[model samples]
Target: MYSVKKSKSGYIFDKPRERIAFMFLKDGTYFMYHDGRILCYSLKPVDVSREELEEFERTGEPPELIKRVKAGKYPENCVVKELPPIDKGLAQLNPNRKCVIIFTGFQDTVIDYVECNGETLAVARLIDEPGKVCRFAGKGNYKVAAVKLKRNEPCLTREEFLKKVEECR
Candidate 1:
């Protein structure tokens, strides 16, 4: 059947009959395995600061704070920070960090910010066609970047932004 075991590193979910195992690391990451081979792994969250949080809130854009951490290689002595209120037009890429969209047949794209439904959302144009714009809600295939955006870039409303995305699609 199924059982859970605790290890020095974290917890393990074991299915003895099926020979499957999933490991949940203490640092908030996880992986699945079968037949001694890892099937998949998850990304870890990184650290952020008070000023960065403030900046994210003020601009309704992602601060440079949110990023991906390599599995099993987190920042030394990292501590969790309280997340700021995101109800008021605040927007962030998944992991609350800067991210770049990678496409197979297109150049990588970078997203800007726009306000929609009283909240901020990440928006970007396809690299191959700058005329088309779209919005991203969560991290899917996007990879985190360690870059910053120029401050005070103009923000767009939902109607204005969606019109562009619709035209592109």
Candidate 2:
């Protein structure tokens, strides 16, 4: 299993295809998401003992506290956010609502948006770029989020779009 570490800026979850993008708010809160799930609220990494912290600094391994975390044991200090998944299916009928693919300034090279139930949400495929051909339909932010191993990294999901929804509303 991989370990967790903090940066001068933020945190990192070191696991295959594990990626999270977030913004630290002035309210001492964090708006975070990985794949499609908005993962946490005001999430903060738990502190380790002086010995453990020094050990991590000397060797590259995080001590028992963090190794447990890498094994799906989130430190209790980190608050987990719970929000119901958004409408998973396409709306029955809505002319204005639609999913559109928006380029990530990569000019058809990278996939940034995916169509879903008349909504365009961020998506990233395992491939370095958009697939030659593909189709997707699902409700959970990351359909394969619980997997022990993933073949590729994540780009975006409806969860982030939901953040926009909250902002707009």
Candidate 3:
């Protein structure tokens, strides 16, 4: 079995795949089992990196990649702005309109905004996990967020982040 973890964060599953790409896990995939199905996870080879285990400790100014991202030079055309969180009236909405993604652990992940015009989509290339693609999204699915997973913001080097920000451009 493989132990899977989310690559980055800030992505959520509010209204299934209403107009966005869905995140899923395959059923036949391998994964690590702990206490029945309570702690099931998969392995992702692509997300594995030599520095993965120690990526957080090698800091000295967020690295060149992060620096570039904050400077808005790589993707060149993205309007990256930090926004303050607001209450989306999720729990009390008529049709439910709140979404958020949680990260567990990962290595080299790619988080890219994937839509244009009146379209907005967020995609992430997580490491290769063992199980089949697990789909946590559906058109009629709903979750009270009972299983909350505190995760880091989907992080990328300045270059990687900016490139993704402008990828569809």
Candidate 4:
């Protein structure tokens, strides 16, 4: 059994590494800002529950850690972002081809999980960088599903995307 308890440094489930808190943004989304692909501080090993660690490895969420973040109640960091009144941008359509989008109200959110092409599984995340546009395409079975459109982050540029595409092939 694993548990996350609040400590003086922050939430401690392991050791040394300070756990940061997940920001439930005003945009109606959860944000985990970290120094690495997984949240940790100063290249330190993240203190986490064994169960939490297992989940992150198996799926992608490290329990409360990935689902949210580490520790500390830094009020300064609590900034709420508003969602799209068209504010939170998603993908642009080609207009020349087929495109149909749906809204389950899970953009850039924790619950944003989609099953496409029947077997392909995806979660909402940053497109590339902060300020670029989000786009979509086919993967396995679906005709078109959105990709790269995390709430506060940015996505890859066209040139970058092309280079990545070239690299893969």
Q: What TM-score goes with each of the models?
A: 0.22, 0.27, 0.20, 0.24
Model 2 regions more than 4 Å off: 1-7, 10-13, 19-45, 49-60, 81-169
Model 3 segments more than 4 A misplaced: 1-55, 76-169
Shift of residue 153 alpha carbon in model 1, Å:
3.7
Worst 10 residues of 4 by lDDT: 93-102
Q: Kindly list the per-residue Cα lDDT of model 4 for residues 135-157, writing each as its tens digit.
A: 33225422222333434335444
Which stretch of 10 consecutive residues in model 1 shows the poorest summed lDDT?
142-151
lDDT of every model, 2 decimals:
0.33, 0.34, 0.25, 0.31
Tens digit per residue, CA lDDT, model 2, 40-132? 322553344445544555665755654554455665566443222323321121111111111112211112333345444333332223232
Best by lDDT: 2
Q: Which residue segments of model 1 deviate by more than 4 Å?
A: 1-68, 77-150
The best-first sequence of candidates by lDDT reads 2, 1, 4, 3
lDDT of 1 by residue, 1-169 (tens): 2344545443333332112222334554333222111122233433434354444445543333222221323244332222122212223322121212211122333344433444444554333444444444333322211111122234355576455444433
Query: Model 4 scores what on Cα lDDT?
Result: 0.31
lDDT (C-alpha) at residue 168 in model 4: 36
Better of 1 and 4 by TM-score: 4
Per-residue error (Å), model 2, residue 47: 1.4
